[PDB]
Design a protein around this ligand. Structure first.
Ligand SMILES: Nc1ncnc2c1ncn2[C@@H]1O[C@H](COP(=O)(O)OP(=O)(O)O)[C@@H](O)[C@H]1O
Lengths: 429, 286, 136
């Protein structure tokens, strides 16, 4: 009951919120169920509880990125009551949702075109999925299908659109999709949709960078964490499947002693597999502690990555020419992780981390400054200096000094400005 | 809002005067005339006509002193509230006969709650209004014994018995649970659970539907259940529901046409109409 | 519009109160099996002030948790609007969808667990039969 409640609250409420807000919401809910002694499985992961491996692989083959945020959102689109409203700065989500619904001939349209009604009821008749973009200029005759009103008369479901009456065909789903992250929907439309947010933020990008580091630098930590995720659902399903194979083989053989060798090999393999699972279970929390330690070791680098990238996007404020995309930073990051001459023969993990951090700063500055005005080079250098200062340990934050340096020089202290010594001038004084 | 100043070239010809809300003496005279006309149905309460008006005028007065448009935009008061008050009491007294003053003030307080108390937002204002109703009733009528104002339920419904009588809260809860049962069976398969304030608002909607009044305005968050309760109460009282399905290329002449359709279907044919529409149906000020 | 707000009778139908939310939680979760005799009664967690029993049971504790999570989303939107903004309002329809998801997923997971347990029992009985066979 507890884990089911947590998962339902996540898939029904925790939409439109970035990863940190969803995680805080889940933590608050789990803390309350701990206060209520409601037995929910500890440290549960919603990515694979609501979905076994098969559809994860299908989504990956359906042009979906491997982010935890995108995985949870694919969960939300998979299991929904109110028709989703996809929010995505990029086109990854729309491509994924079309590739997922190719067999059932999903169609493309938008609110702006004059043919939206026509293919709307055309998809309503044959049960065709319908994706529609540009939700900003919302269309009111979409209301009675969002409310899912059903006028079932005479042993058959009906629906009303305008002055028309239409037969509501089963297996019909509509996916609303938008392009602009910063839009304010009205509450009437907000209530009828399950918001799915694909906007990348500091939290999401931090998660991607940390996962990529764990995959690249320490594949053993990555495999251990992956085994932890599969431990809850995937290993048990494999175990049940191969048990069913054992039962089928026993039935076909009928328990002959002559075939006892082939069956005993299977049962010994079974016992070994079970011993492996139990060993993972008995060593679970050690693995959790080790993964936590490694994640804390590599935590500042991911924060630096997110800060650098969001600094790159903020660079458009200085000049219209400093437009940078997430793909640019991802390419920078891939080049730093893999194509690094400085990691040709380095083996110490802490040394590798330090070299990656330093080379990431160097390469990011070098690529950005190559297409940036010379008068602006020192500004971005100072920005990266601030990022390292926030990321470095053993140093004070220097918040007051930097605040003065930045904006504290515009404060009202003109009173009592003594001329002092002849060297000091009025503005100097 | 939506009002534009007149051109000085045209204002020069036209004189204008400010007709403010009628003063306490004028309201007292007008609604005392209405009361004296009203209570001639039951001669047993003719002598309690002037004080009845005085109490309504006073209640209106301190309802206008507070609850300004600064507090809430919907916090507006006009003699329209008083005429609806008089009309509601008359509609309730229409079947009632040989009614003592007990019922007179009981329906007076019920209408006071249904006009100056359900439009409120916070609990403190609601309890202030209830306290003022009790205090005014005691002030103008202190010979009446205290069995009418301390009645906390103070709810009416024509559904039980045959005419408009005070009813018991649980005796009405069971009845409306049975009716809502039969309801969800006929249309709206989605189950509806009956809690306290939903019972309150279904009673208020029924009360507003029964009278020869024109409109019900429902204020609240989306998805809370205004439309479903309006449809359900219209189902009880046999009011047909006409919903307008607007769209992007919807135009004003369509609103004119379905408006005149509603008027003909309500006036030419005696069947009653509960015409329901929302903000999404409104696009322009026309 | 003051003219329209004055010309009719105005009724404030606000968002569902805590008692309303709690009653909806009970009535929409009645059909599921949430009876846990061995539920050790905890203390605190005031969310709804009228708990039907002073010691809550499993069903009532879980419905209390549902109304708590709805209140938690309300508080999260209030906080997010306070710091910056960019918040979409939550309506009781969200609560209805939450309860519907909880019910459907609870039935699905319970049913799959019963199916696995029944397959386990069938396997046990069949293996007992084949043990008898090899003994013979
Ligand atoms: N008292 C109630 N109990 C259960 N469900 C309700 C209740 N009131 C409203 N609903 C739900 O609200 C939905 C319709 O809401 P609606 O009346 O359209 O809200 P709004 O008036 O804000 O548009 C229905 O599906 C219904 O299940």
């Amino acid at each position: 009951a507890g884990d089911c409640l947590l998962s339902a609250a996540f898939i029904a409420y925790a939409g439109y919120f970035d990863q940190q807000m969803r995680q805080n919401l889940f933590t608050t809910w789990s803390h309350h169920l701990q206060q209520a002694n409601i037995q929910f499985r500890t440290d549960i992961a919603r990515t694979e509880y609501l979905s076994n491996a098969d559809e994860r692989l299908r989504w990956q083959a359906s042009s979906l990125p491997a982010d935890d945020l995108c995985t949870e959102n694919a969960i939300m689109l998979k299991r929904f009551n109110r028709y989703p409203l996809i929010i995505d700065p990029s086109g990854q989500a729309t491509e994924f949702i079309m590739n997922e619904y190719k067999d059932r001939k999903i169609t493309r349209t938008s609110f702006l075109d004059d043919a939206f009604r026509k293919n709307l009821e055309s998809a309503l008749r044959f049960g065709n999925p319908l994706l529609v973009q540009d939700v900003e200029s919302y269309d009111p005759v979409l209301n009675p299908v969002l409310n899912r009103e059903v006028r079932r008369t005479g042993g058959r479901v009906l629906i009303t659109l305008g002055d028309q009456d239409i037969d509501l065909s089963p297996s019909f789903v509509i996916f609303l999709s938008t392009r602009d992250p910063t839009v304010e929907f009205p509450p009437d439309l907000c209530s009828r949709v399950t918001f799915v947010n694909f906007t990348v933020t500091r939290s999401s990008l931090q998660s991607q960078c940390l996962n990529e580091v764990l995959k690249a630098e320490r594949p053993d930590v990555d495999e251990k964490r992956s085994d932890l995720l599969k431990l809850q659902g995937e290993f048990q399903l494999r175990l049940r499947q191969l048990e069913k194979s054992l039962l089928q083989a026993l039935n076909e053989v009928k328990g002959r002693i002559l075939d006892d060798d082939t069956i005993i090999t299977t049962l010994e393999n079974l016992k070994r597999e079970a011993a492996e699972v139990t060993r993972k279970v008995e060593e679970t929390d050690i693995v959790m502690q080790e993964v936590e330690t490694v994640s804390q070791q590599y935590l500042p680098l991911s924060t630096a990555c997110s800060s650098i990238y969001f600094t790159m996007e903020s660079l458009k404020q200085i000049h219209f020419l400093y437009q940078y995309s997430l793909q640019f930073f991802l390419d920078i990051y891939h080049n730093v992780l893999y194509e690094n001459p400085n990691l040709k023969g380095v083996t110490d993990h802490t040394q590798r981390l330090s070299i990656i951090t330093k080379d990431l700063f160097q390469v990011a500055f070098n690529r950005v400054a190559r297409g940036m005005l010379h008068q602006d080079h020192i500004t971005f250098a100072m920005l990266l200096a601030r990022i390292k200062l926030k990321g470095t340990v053993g140093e004070p934050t220097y918040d007051a000094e930097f605040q003065h340096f930045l904006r504290g020089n515009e404060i009202v202290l003109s009173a009592g400005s003594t001329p002092r010594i002849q060297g000091l001038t009025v503005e100097q004084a | 809002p939506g009002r534009k100043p007149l051109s000085h070239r045209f204002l020069r010809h036209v004189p204008v005067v400010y007709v403010d809300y009628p003063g306490p003496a004028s309201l007292t005279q007008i609604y005392g005339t209405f009361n004296r006309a009203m209570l001639r149905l039951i001669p047993s309460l003719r002598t309690y006509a002037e004080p009845l008006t005085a109490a309504m005028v006073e209640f209106y007065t301190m309802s206008q002193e507070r609850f300004t448009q600064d507090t809430q935009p919907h916090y507006i008061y006009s003699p329209r509230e008083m005429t609806r008050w008089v009309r509601g009491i008359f509609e309730a007294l229409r079947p009632l006969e040989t009614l003592p003053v007990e019922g007179l003030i009981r329906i007076w307080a019920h209408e006071a709650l249904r006009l100056f108390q359900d439009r409120l937002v916070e609990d403190e204002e609601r309890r202030w209004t209830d306290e003022n109703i009790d205090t005014v009733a005691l002030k103008h009528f202190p010979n009446i014994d205290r069995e009418k104002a301390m009645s906390r339920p103070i709810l009416y419904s024509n559904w039980l018995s045959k005419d408009y009588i005070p009813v018991d809260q649980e005796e009405l809860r069971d009845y409306v649970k049975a009716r809502l049962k039969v309801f969800y069976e006929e249309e709206l398969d989605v189950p509806l659970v009956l809690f306290n304030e939903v019972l309150d608002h279904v009673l208020r909607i029924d009360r507003i539907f029964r009278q020869p009044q024109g409109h019900l305005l429902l204020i609240g968050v989306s998805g809370a259940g205004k439309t479903t309760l309006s449809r359900f109460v219209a189902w009880m009282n046999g009011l047909s529901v006409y919903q307008i399905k607007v769209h992007r290329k919807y135009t004003g002449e369509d609103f004119d046409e379905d408006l005149r359709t509603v008027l003909r279907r309500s006036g030419c044919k005696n069947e009653k109409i509960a015409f329901i529409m929302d903000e999404s149906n409104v696009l322009d000020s026309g | 519009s003051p003219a329209l707000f004055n010309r009719c009778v105005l009724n404030w139908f606000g968002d569902w109160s805590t008692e309303a939310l709690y009653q909806v939680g009970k009535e929409f979760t009645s059909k599921m099996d949430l009876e846990k005799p061995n539920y050790i009664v905890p203390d605190y967690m005031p969310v709804v002030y009228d708990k039907l029993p002073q010691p809550p049971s499993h069903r009532e504790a879980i419905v209390n948790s549902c109304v708590f999570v709805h209140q938690t989303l309300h508080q999260a939107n209030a906080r997010l609007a306070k710091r910056g903004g960019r918040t979409m309002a939550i309506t009781p329809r969200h609560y209805l969808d939450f309860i519907n998801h909880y019910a459907n997923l609870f039935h699905e997971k319970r049913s799959e667990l019963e199916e696995q347990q029944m397959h386990l029992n069938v396997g046990l009985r069949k293996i007992k039969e084949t043990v008898d066979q090899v003994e013979e």
